Amino acid sequence: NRDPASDQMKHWKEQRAAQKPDVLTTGGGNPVGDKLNSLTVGPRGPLLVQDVVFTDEMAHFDRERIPERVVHAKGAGAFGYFEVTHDITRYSKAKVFEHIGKRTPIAVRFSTVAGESGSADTVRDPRGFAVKFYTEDGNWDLVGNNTPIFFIRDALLFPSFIHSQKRNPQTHLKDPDMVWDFWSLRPESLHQVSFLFSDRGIPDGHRHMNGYGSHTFKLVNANGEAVYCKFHYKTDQGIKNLSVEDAARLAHEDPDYGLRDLFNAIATGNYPSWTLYIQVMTFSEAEIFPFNPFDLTKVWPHGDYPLIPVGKLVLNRNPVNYFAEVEQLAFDPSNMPPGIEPSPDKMLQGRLFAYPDTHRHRLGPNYLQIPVNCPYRARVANYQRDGPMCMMDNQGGAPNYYPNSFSAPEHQPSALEHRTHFSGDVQRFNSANDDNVTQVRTFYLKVLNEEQRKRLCENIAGHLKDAQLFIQKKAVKNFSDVHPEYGSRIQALLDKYNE
Amino acid sequence: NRDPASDQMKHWKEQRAAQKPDVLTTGGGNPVGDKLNSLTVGPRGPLLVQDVVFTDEMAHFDRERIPERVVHAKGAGAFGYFEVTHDITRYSKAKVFEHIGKRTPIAVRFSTVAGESGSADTVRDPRGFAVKFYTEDGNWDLVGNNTPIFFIRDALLFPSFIHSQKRNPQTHLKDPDMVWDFWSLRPESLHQVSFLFSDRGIPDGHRHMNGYGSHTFKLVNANGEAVYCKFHYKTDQGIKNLSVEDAARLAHEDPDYGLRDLFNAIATGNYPSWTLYIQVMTFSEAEIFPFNPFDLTKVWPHGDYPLIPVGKLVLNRNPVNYFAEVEQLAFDPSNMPPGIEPSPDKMLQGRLFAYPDTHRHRLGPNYLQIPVNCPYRARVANYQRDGPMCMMDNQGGAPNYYPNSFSAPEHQPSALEHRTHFSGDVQRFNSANDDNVTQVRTFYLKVLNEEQRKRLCENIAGHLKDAQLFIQKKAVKNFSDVHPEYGSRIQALLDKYNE
Amino acid sequence: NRDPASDQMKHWKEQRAAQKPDVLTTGGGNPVGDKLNSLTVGPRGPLLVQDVVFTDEMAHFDRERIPERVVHAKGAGAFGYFEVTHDITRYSKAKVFEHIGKRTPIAVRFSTVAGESGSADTVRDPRGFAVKFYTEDGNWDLVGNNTPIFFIRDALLFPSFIHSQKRNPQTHLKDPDMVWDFWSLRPESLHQVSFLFSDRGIPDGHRHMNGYGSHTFKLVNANGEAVYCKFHYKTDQGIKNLSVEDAARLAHEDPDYGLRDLFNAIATGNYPSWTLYIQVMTFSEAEIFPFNPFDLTKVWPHGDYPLIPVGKLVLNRNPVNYFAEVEQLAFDPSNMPPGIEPSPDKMLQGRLFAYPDTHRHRLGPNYLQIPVNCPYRARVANYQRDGPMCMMDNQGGAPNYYPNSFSAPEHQPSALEHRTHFSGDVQRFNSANDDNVTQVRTFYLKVLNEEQRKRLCENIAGHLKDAQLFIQKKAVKNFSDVHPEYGSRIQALLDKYNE
Amino acid sequence: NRDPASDQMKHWKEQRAAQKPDVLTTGGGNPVGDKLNSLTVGPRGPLLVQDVVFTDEMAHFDRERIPERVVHAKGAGAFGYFEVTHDITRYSKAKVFEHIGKRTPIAVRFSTVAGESGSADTVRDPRGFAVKFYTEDGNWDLVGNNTPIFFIRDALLFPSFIHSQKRNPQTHLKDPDMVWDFWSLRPESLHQVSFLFSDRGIPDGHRHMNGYGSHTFKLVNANGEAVYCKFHYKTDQGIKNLSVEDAARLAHEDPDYGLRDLFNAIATGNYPSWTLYIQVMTFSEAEIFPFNPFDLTKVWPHGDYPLIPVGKLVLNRNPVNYFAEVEQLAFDPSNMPPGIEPSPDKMLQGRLFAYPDTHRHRLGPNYLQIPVNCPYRARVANYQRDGPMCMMDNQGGAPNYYPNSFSAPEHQPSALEHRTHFSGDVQRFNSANDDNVTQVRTFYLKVLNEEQRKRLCENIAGHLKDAQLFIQKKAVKNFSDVHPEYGSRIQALLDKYNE
Numbered sequence A, B, C, D: 001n002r003d004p005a006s007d008q009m010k011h012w013k014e015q016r017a018a019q020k021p022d023v024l025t026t027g028g029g030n031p032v033g034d035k036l037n038s039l040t041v042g043p044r045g046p047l048l049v050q051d052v053v054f055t056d057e058m059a060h061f062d063r064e065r066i067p068e069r070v071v072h073a074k075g076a077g078a079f080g081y082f083e084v085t086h087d088i089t090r091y092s093k094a095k096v097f098e099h100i101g102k103r104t105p106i107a108v109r110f111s112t113v114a115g116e117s118g119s120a121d122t123v124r125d126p127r128g129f130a131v132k133f134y135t136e137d138g139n140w141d142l143v144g145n146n147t148p149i150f151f152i153r154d155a156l157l158f159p160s161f162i163h164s165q166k167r168n169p170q171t172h173l174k175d176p177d178m179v180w181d182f183w184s185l186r187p188e189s190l191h192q193v194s195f196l197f198s199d200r201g202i203p204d205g206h207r208h209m210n211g212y213g214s215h216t217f218k219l220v221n222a223n224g225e226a227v228y229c230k231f232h233y234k235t236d237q238g239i240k241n242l243s244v245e246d247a248a249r250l251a252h253e254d255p256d257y258g259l260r261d262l263f264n265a266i267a268t269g270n271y272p273s274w275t276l277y278i279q280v281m282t283f284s285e286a287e288i289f290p291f292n293p294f295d296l297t298k299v300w301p302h303g304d305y306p307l308i309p310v311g312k313l314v315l316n317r318n319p320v321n322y323f324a325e326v327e328q329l330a331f332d333p334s335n336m337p338p339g340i341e342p343s344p345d346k347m348l349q350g351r352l353f354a355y356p357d358t359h360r361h362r363l364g365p366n367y368l369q370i371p372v373n374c375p376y377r378a379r380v381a382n383y384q385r386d387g388p389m390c391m392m393d394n395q396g397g398a399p400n401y402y403p404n405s406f407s408a409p410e411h412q413p414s415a416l417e418h419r420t421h422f423s424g425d426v427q428r429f430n431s432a433n434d435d436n437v438t439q440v441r442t443f444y445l446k447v448l449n450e451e452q453r454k455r456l457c458e459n460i461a462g463h464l465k466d467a468q469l470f471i472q473k474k475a476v477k478n479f480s481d482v483h484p485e486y487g488s489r490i491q492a493l494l495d496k497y498n499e
């Protein structure tokens, strides 16, 4: 006997033993009489196009794939529910926070960031942690990571970052000179780089890490009053990390470690769960906040902005067909129910457009009609019609223009947005020199102990040594700008690694 | 009050008079608070990204169209059923003929051939008359025309013929020289050309015209015995045609004449029906048939192969959304249930490849998952997976390979094809010189009367006059090769049209 | 002999009389031995898969189409040059206006609006008039119409308007009730509706109509000083219109009338030409302007803002292939070289997203790499990579991220945008009741005469009579609101039209 | 200093040091004035739509990816030439074999089989070795592997064999039960599984394995006489293999080992090359051959059929953009010049369709116009038109139909196929029970030595132990069917592995 994943087929048969197998048909429902030998004119004669059975099956085989995600390609999935435990209705009127005990069906997809579909699960890299809430106000996607911050703070640098984290456009190889040339020319990455090369840079699976909205969002209650908030969802299974040496063994020993961990976990009854907290800032607090409260490379400290609990995330169901229910999942940060809204964070302001845009390309123009993506607890009614692979009635014979004298859908004024006042030149403001070392200083000195600082420099140095020396020298300088001992340790190691 | 097709919204509002209009929502099921005014900064300021209501609608609007059909693009549609009235089980085991009084749902599409989506309905052309039978052995697609014959008899010429019946690649105009240079270089078109320009080139809507499968087909019975056969479905509303004068008036007074006519008829209860017949040829009749019995430019004369009634086609339902139910329909001649099989007709052999091919481009790799295309009265089970826009559970966790020891679907030996013997060189045989005049000469002299022969000549000269003289001179020779007087009448009129 | 268009195939042969015909191949360069007879086991046998020559040709004929344009699908095209005859460098620094005499290649496409690919040219509708300037600073796409104004002034209403002008979702029929239920619930359409049903609704070819930028734009000279402008290009051939009686005849006597007029003119040396003008409004004049200067239903009166001439548009070359050079054309209002910038028009602001979006869907992600959409006089260099149908070298091994220290492209600080100050609430302002009648009243009384007001009212009632009464009574009211005699005339004619 | 592959950017900058960086533009050729910060309303404001610099680049990033090959997805590419060195013109007339010293441009792609784009290069799995010859008569693709044989001999089993070798449809995990339940149910795979699990299952990169065409192919000479042949291209660098112990280390130390090995070689002038032989079997020797001469699971023994050299393949150029030259590379076995034809082999007959079918999906309808796919040593001319992404003239205004009296391309009679005579019932012949052991027993005993038999079993047992007992028992029995000591050694090691 083996682990439950290995026995998947074994159980599918036993869960079926009472029946007779189905008749094997074409895609058009036509029964197949033989599907192991091709129609030819003689035993050693050529193939006929009369063999549509072969063209039916082979044609689809040629169209099985679709494009992989441009980022967070290698992923695991599961399904469960969210349950409200505390009252934050003064902050949000969102139905998903209506009363205590209220449950909502969720979907979750974990992922790394850079590697393609076939890369390993135990590598250094941020981890995706995207959550989709099927509410009666339509879906709510909270597309988080395993970290509260990112490497940049303007969305126009994002593609360049990704290109600098993936393959060289000539050799198709991971290129240290691309990784660090960028990080050292853009020191706002110093915060998330110090998180990445810590121990939690390699989590021992998906169940032993926290999630974070990371973006500042906005909440709107039932009076029309607003506050800014951060979301935290912490692991009730405890932080637990792989060591560099173990992670490396499992990288060839079991490329699908985090995929097997999460499946077996739910299959053996061990349901992983997370605790959803928020931080709250008022609008006023947001004007006195020392840093930019909408700078993604900044955390709101806990002592000033403590964590308010909300509810629990629970994963208790596995997918049944991985493609249909995980690969085709499409999370939109623009999917926001009344009561939740975006902040002016530049990065988030870019993600509002990017995610729906790529889903029409990766999946199709009507990807929201795919079952896992559908807002199946909401009544979708509008004037949108047609498009490739149209799957419902196309809303039947309802008037497809607005406004109209025939009683098609109407707008719901209580769902209007919160009104905020802005003033300033319409112009590109240079955010590359916001504080880039203060919070990082705190992390290095007051969060880590001496052994963790020690490992931090060895993981950095074990990767920056391959860069050219003028890149090294420039990255080191950015580390001394955090704390002179931070850089002069890294440098001591580089001095060795350079022979 | 007006015709019912004009009162569509009127009735739609009436049938909804009681209940309340829906909530207008995004594609994501999020209600919108106002959809007549965009999100801007100030009453005379610019548009924001935040306005995801505008992007969501405008994005889908941008993605309404799909590539029209490459031929037969102007269509009308309707739905109904087929009912068996006579017993033809001694020839075919096809369940759809299992017993008298057994009904099977059908879907139909009437179309022209050459015009684009916005062309007029009352033009000289062949007409589509495609029928889809939703049977228990999977779907059966009888894709025919309003003719028993076609212009050519080898597929490799089909792209060329169509290009010659559409727009010049530089001027993008209808070109007579292209039309008649082909027709006069390929006289096998004499039989269908005669038909086209006579009275039945412009029918009075789609309810006053017959339907034929034109190809020869093979029927197989429960003993494995096989006969060839032709399909005729004759209109129970009577052959009735439009004049050239009345066609050219409606061509601008109501481009959608046919469309309207079918809709109104069904709505008022006036349900059209066709009587399905078959002809039956034995294998040993096929060896002594004077012509090639799979020649698509040939018919089976009635005196030697009489018509055998089978059942009725009946259309009693209008589409609800024309796009989802008529424009996304896909008919594949290769959708044949056990009992019905292809002949060796060179033209049918290419349609076995082409239709599923073009449907994967126009509609999508999983186009058989579109409801009106679904075989919803069979059980689709097989080892095809994935592909863009998957819409069912993708078959669940069922073993996806074959053979297996876990009881995935199995092959049904009774659905094996009938086995014929063939012997001959594997080469390209010349079918340009099979008898191209005999059956036409009969048609011109024995079928048409004096007045019809006169009108057949005028219509040909009326369209053949605009081609160059060397093209008119060759075409008239081919006509003179059918009957001398045929060419003399056409040639007399051309001498006049040429001033 | 016949007109030049009809003789296109004749002239192609003559221009090659001296050469030998090319060798016919597959798409793979493999010469074909026979393409008139299919590969079959014996003369009367089944077709083989080995027959790659059939599949290579039938595969590509199955993929010939693409999605037509969601609007303006029917169009004619030609190529020529824009030449500067006057100096407007004090207003705009654009290199297309640099000095008097400078020529820039252009590509124009004329169009109707609603009719699909096969509709007639001579129908009441607006006419597109798009102009693509190929500048050294990248393309400039002045996507104008044959009118200065439009039917709505908010992009969100745009999908609705269109859907009302096109076909009913259930009957696939032009629906009068959908046309006027819209127009009468949105009386900002009054101004452009009165343009459309007037004599200029049906131009006599594309050479006898003016072209307008319509939108207010922004120009920016070299000192950084900006103004607001309107682009009028007026026909040098004279305004010439068709009568309702002649336009209907041609609609079935030559559905491609304008397509044949544009080609024949050009072929005979009779090149059509336009005169480009600009209006100019200073930032301070805009503030006082009685209407909203960025309202798209409004014009700038000539006495207050008189036409400034700039240069000449000349069309002097027919497309050699219609598909690759006209069908594949793609104009993006967003294509604007330094010196030309958008105004805060709500409709234009929408059109900055719309056009690139749909061109990815209609033609593909790399649609700008089609030769006719190429900026083939500027040097494209950046950090965009890959995509479907990548056709050049893909910018080589160049560093693909920005910033970098390896001397890949750099930004150009002179090419920044003009900075404006805006201040206000971020919200959805209501523009529905901006002055809707004034400039229409002026048009009814002062621009038309006694006859023309008569014809305008017969045209409106001729089409409005088919709507429902409750939709008539409203439209007339909106017409009375322009002038009591306006809607009283319309109401008298409707009284008879309702028997 | 480092290897050449890491100094890629270093040499790019150095190869440009003279000239100045280009101006960073938009896709439209518009210069940008700042591409690091986004257009907002005040420094902490929201993003705008008229930030077309952000949209233009992100929308392309969202579309960087296409579908990955459905098999052989991991690969590495190189370009060089093929040179003739012997005279095989008595067998083939093909232009590539005209005379000694004739060179032709080639392009080669290496690959594994089951891994996706991210997988590792040093794993047990066959190796692709596809070769494209750009000859005057079009392109000649010789799509070979690193083995002479394959696991099956019918194409209707391919999608299933690949399904078993990839990921479970529910767990997305490699599934040894799927692997051996297939292999142990189809024992034809005995021959190739034994090659796979010997030392040549993991080569030391792509420069030390052989290439083979596996399928029997036809040659035809200038007289019209044919023979059946095999293609062998052996490595002039020497067979060299990785041990299970190092192959695993490198599968996490350097996932791209084989790709780096090839590039670094070429970049240092150590060019790899291969020697092209053929075997020859007349038609008479084919009738008496002990097995089926077209059975993909059977080799032709050297002693009866010796190798006949032909020439050399040499790789002396690296790609400049991997994506645009290696990922878009399209090989079609159907690309065959006159002189070379397919043999009746049941598996090759399916590849004649499958590849062009998947290249119209993966890349697009016009994937042959992509530079590296162009038959740029040959002149493409025909009557195929349009299609998505048509990039040249579209063959201009030439006539698009055939035959024509206007001098468009003609057929070339000498390029006709060789006529073979086939006689036999058209049906589905069973090929499961062709001799499944004979040539294997020869390999095991006579080709391997004592050591190599030992490791062959160990490699097999390590992977088979994870499969259920009932699947083990059936596998071993298929290894007892080759040789009792074969299934014995495997059963003694499985006894240990099962504790």
Ligand SMILES: NC(=O)C1=CN([C@@H]2O[C@H](COP(=O)(O)OP(=O)(O)OC[C@H]3O[C@@H](n4cnc5c(N)ncnc54)[C@H](OP(=O)(O)O)[C@@H]3O)[C@@H](O)[C@H]2O)C=CC1
Binding pocket: D148, D195, D198, D199, D200, D210, D234, D239, D299, D300, D301, D302, D303, D439, D440, D442, D443, D447
């Ligand atoms: N005859 C052929 O075309 C080939 C035959 N074989 C195997 O050889 C057996 C006998 O063929 P025969 O020609 O009579 O005897 P030969 O000894 O004449 O052929 C022996 C072949 O074995 C190949 N070989 C050596 N080690 C391995 C390995 N680990 N995995 C795969 N192939 C290997 C060599 O290929 P090289 O030295 O060319 O690299 C050599 O050419 C066949 O049954 C077949 O299994 C294998 C490859 C080609």
